[PDB]
């Protein structure tokens, strides 16, 4: 019926319902590290998550979303390429069926096992639905995951997944601190792009950290036990929920580091 990640409804089909799929600023993209240019005009990046208030985790049939109370100026992203203040609304991941794929952005064509997206909206537009209608409406902080050592700050997420196995299920998810998902370094690449799922709106300033976080094989295996289907339907494992790299077109990727 609707869009997803399969042969018959996956990324290569999305353009029929969402023609912007073939637009001028689509995401993700390949980050060619040799062509990205250091930009001295970039101000320092500010990730201020100390007062973040998580609420709930939801399996939406595409990924799982950890949702935050964004009714107050709490968890915010500022600086870097951004003008003004962007408020955290949710995070989610994209991942693969195997450790050699899963990320949406690639780095010199390298695919990581997964990619975390911390989604923020520009407070100048008042709320998320108005923000996605603007070219500078969203800022998505993207963080690569590689398989190696466990990420202790991820385990609370992993352990709730059994309770939201299928599409439409949610669970209370309070007091989760997203600071535990960040790598040491805030070095990043940035470029103007889009949502990577329908409606594919061209409203995102992408900020993709250079340093991946490490998660354990067991952690990512638990992601792959989720289901795309609803309860009581035949099992379709939630794997390979990533859009591949799209044409860069008339864009430059800027680096925050020399
Ligand atoms: C049977 O019903 C289907 C409905 C749709 C699709 C596939 C289906 O079966 C394969 C995909 C191709 N489009 S979309 N949004 O362009 O990916 C959504 C509508
Ligand atoms: C349905 O809930 C959401 C899903 C998605 C996003 C935000 C959501 O709630 C705010 C953002 C925009 N991503 S992405 N991959 O960072 O571009 C697409 C998927
Ligand atoms: Zn995403």
From Swiss-Prot:
Its cofactor is Zn(2+); Co(2+). The record marks 5, 60, 65 as: Fine-tunes the proton-transfer properties of H-64. GO terms for biological process: angiotensin-activated signaling pathway; carbon dioxide transport; morphogenesis of an epithelium; neuron cellular homeostasis; positive regulation of cellular pH reduction; positive regulation of dipeptide transmembrane transport; positive regulation of synaptic transmission, GABAergic; regulation of chloride transport. Changing residue 65 to Q: 2-fold decrease in enzyme efficiency, as determined by kcat/KM ratio, and efficiently inhibited by chlorzolamide. Changing residue 92 to Y: In OPTB3; partial loss of activity. GO terms for cellular component: apical part of cell; cytoplasm; cytosol; extracellular exosome; myelin sheath; plasma membrane. It is found in: Cytoplasm; Cell membrane. Interacts with SLC4A4. Interaction with SLC4A7 regulates SLC4A7 transporter activity. Interacts with SLC26A6 isoform 4 (via C-terminus cytoplasmic domain). This is Carbonic anhydrase 2. It comes from Homo sapiens (Human). The gene is CA2.
